[PDB]
């Protein structure tokens, strides 16, 4: 039969094993470990799988070399700005948690020491500020905080300055040997939608912004830094309103009455700055991201099934009490290969409803109560949808209606298959687990005796999808009536593998013929003991339900026109 | 059989607990918690229930319970009847209590990856072991007795929060004697989930 | 790994290290740079406002010395902006809407940026045509690729379409103008990849009284951006329009007396 | 015996002062190949009096840990299924003869208790669990190696 072998590849086993056991290696990534300095935590922390990294974005982005300013109460509260203007921001690098704030401009004051200022809790245990800490080749400003004040109301603007004309420190032609200076001269524009820091649109410049106007702020800033001992100083030199523009980019004089009235009360000053530096150590004292592998191995075993037998009087031949020997074989083939497989499929559908919910993905190793070893190579995914063909089909003429319904259903199938390939990541799993070639995900379509002839007649918009292969499975059983079940199948493999949807656990059994004088009678009997089971791996499946199929064909449904509020009712 | 499935699929060799009402009552859960249900094998109908966990030693004999009236008429329990290669927990029950209200759920842990008696080689040579540790989840729109919602988990299910119960169950079975035992080691909730697949702390106001 | 026994089981071969490096560098940093450039262009240039050449000092790109700055954004509502008459022709109509919109964006950008004049001025003896580079997610391109009867994806313009699995660019279409045939930095390019090779150094460390072998890679690379031109368009509510049919916006002429 | 909730992390429990002074231990700190039960502490109660018997159950045939054929590849299990006895001249607290069992010892009788202790241990991070699952008196033995009935007047 086609259906049972379509979803469950036959895997034959000799009668000398009680089952089969699988071994799979997983390669996983994780930062920092217990050790014995704290022996921290029972059952430790979680470890991530690397394959999840292909789909996620904070999985690999790590920074430990960054030299970000750090607050220490009562130590460096003088070098930072007064926190009464802006509260300290929290940042995380490595496993340290600490608060940061913008370094301030000083004119006549002493310079600071960036190298020392950025000591974080991880460093302190590892050793406080040794010789070989050397700043990287490039150091640049990232944000500048200017205070645009209108009538006593203060709005702070964290202007992103890392990306601009000139913010990269330049080596000097002379003076000392490592003195790198900052010679910063440009105008910073405040766009009509340039938001205030910490969200919220700029409520002060609205008057110019409502007219679509913009202001040009030129900035006059200089600085110097030493790249050997971490010392340097930076000072702001000038900052004022330079130019104002219109929507056409044409210079507008500041002497116009409207713009002058709008600019009355405008004073702009620079508060502080933040500076990016990376500690290029040649010896280095960081632990990167530790890489390991673990092995999860599973035990699968195969039992027997209840017996079947025919009894007949032991003196005669019969086609009455026993037709030939084929009857038991046919009954057994039904027993095995149809009802049990269909029941397994439906029970998996119910189970996936119970666990995964409707149409929601889960991360890798998100659940282990699910059966199947395939759970380590792909996000679990189960989704269902129904099509009310009576209320959804398009009708133009009475002649092409079957073509229209065929197109609708095939488009729905394409939608589900493509979105499954998008959300699961199965495609990359096929790309990786096999390397000899990149086969297209081979799709199988199983359903009852009803639907298939409404899927393939002629006029297929797209077969099941471009570059997609399909196999159509048909079965007469009732409880599969008026449904479509689809999944992902490998047609080129025979052995157990996490990318099979199912494997039919099969061991041969042979007829048992001999006399038993039991119950104090004599008769000939033929004992049949089937021993098989269905084992399924991949936790991915999609199902489609159809209703009102009869209703649409025998009753016209056309043109649900959507009047769009032209007859006055707002 | 070509059209309907139930015209076939007969059981006649599966061992199922049978109530004798006075001869083996001690090894079942009391009938004051869950009423017995009637099931049919062959032509014989009888009562069945769930084997109580062995909270304190006193293992059970499996063949002492599996005498159906068909087996009673067949004479004495045959001395050579041996267990099959597979014995597993077909059904696990849980009782959740809040304010004195008791509800029972039926968790179908059949066919799960860690719920099959495996051969153990430390003791004797026909001993099967069970070693059950996993997280049994509860359906956000199912799992009451066969599905659907409940009367004690509304607050999580209406927002759609999913509960994972960690289970520690150990067991042993002898496939020549019929002696075996099963004990619950630990059972509690650990984590709470939602659509996003990220857990929520057990200290948040709504979950708490 | 332990520095007394080789272990190819806990640590795989060098290939796992190299591929982790390759993924991190060559995907995530590039995506960060692209999206941040989009955001900063949004912040500075407003929306859909051309600027006079070399009048927007304060944003990188020597390209501003040849081309007016320009950034515009658009939104496609497939559910409310699609036309159907028959279920068998819905996907072609979806393709029609999306391709027509992208063509309109390309033409408007070329109109208001004057990229053709800059292109012909920069290179002499040849008059190439502007090349459109388009990136997107893993689900959309086959709704751009032709199916039976459909027109070119941009008339008279050659193009490239890219695939990415990362989940920022889901239902996103990002495009701009680039030069395919040049390998040295030009003011007309979108950007260049500054790259400095790293060699592996493997040796032992004694950290907090340790004995273990350590493997280190220090990457040296930096992404720079040149052309201050880009168009960002997103498509929303697609699967609903595919599953749920919409049809026939109808405007009454109010001949039923109301006006 | 921790039964519910958290297990125990052994590596946490072995943080000796010298180990504090020395910093941190090396990578992949692994447990011993075998894990053994060096003592089992049982309590006997008769009428309200509790006496502790420190039974050194080491070297008995089933005090060794072995690897599991499921779960992780480092999880080792413990199944300790045997009979423990308390005798007249066997080493016990308050002498070889204790106060609560003096009556049986004078009659030359030694009691046998069936103990059924199972557990789990991992040798990668030091976490593991163990539970006492069954322990009671089963058989009583005389000075002649034959089991005496529990219903008999003297032993009962």
Numbering used by the authors:
A (entry chain C): 28 to 597
B (entry chain F): 80 to 287
C (entry chain B): 339 to 597
D (entry chain k): 132 to 287
Please share text taken word for word from the publication where this structure appeared.
The Klebsiella jumbo myophage ϕKp24 displays an unusually complex arrangement of tail fibers interacting with a host cell. We observe the tail fibers are branched and rearranged dramatically upon cell surface attachment. This complex configuration involves fourteen putative tail fibers with depolymerase activity that provide ϕKp24 with the ability to infect a broad panel of capsular polysaccharide (CPS) types of Klebsiella pneumoniae. In this study, we combine cryo-electron microscopy methods, protein structure prediction methods, molecular simulations, microbiological and machine learning approaches to explore the capsid, tail, and tail fibers of ϕKp24. We determine the structure of the capsid and tail at 4.1 Å and 3.0 Å resolution.
The hexamers and pentamers of ϕKp24 are made up of copies of the same major capsid protein (MCP, gp372, accession number QQV92002). Gp372 contains 597 amino acids and is to our knowledge the largest MCP currently described in any phage. It consists of three major parts: a “triangular body” (gray triangle, dotted box, residues 28–88, 314–597); an “arm” (blue oval, blue, residues 89-166); and a “hand” (orange oval, orange, residues 167–313). Briefly, models of the hexamer and pentamer assemblies were first constructed via rigid docking of the predicted gp372 structure and subsequently refined to our 4.1 Å map using molecular dynamics flexible fitting (MDFF). The triangular body of the MCPs interacts primarily with the triangular bodies of the MCPs directly adjacent and within the same hexamer. These interactions include a series of complimentary salt bridges between residue R477 and E442 on the clockwise neighbor, as well as residue R583 and both D419 and D587 on the clockwise neighbor. The triangular body also interacts strongly with the hand region of its clockwise neighbor through a series of salt bridges, including K380/E220, E398/R190, R554/E313, and R558/D163. In addition to these interactions formed between MCPs within the same hexamer, the hand region also mediates strong interactions with the hand region of an MCP from an adjacent hexamer. These involve a large cluster of charged residues, including E201, K210, K247, D249, E251, D260, and R264, which form complementary interactions. Finally, compared to other known phage capsid structures, the MCP of ϕKp24 displayed a structural feature that has, to our knowledge, not been previously reported: each of the six long C-terminal loops (residues Q582-S597) participate in the formation of a central helical pore with an outer diameter of ~2 nm.
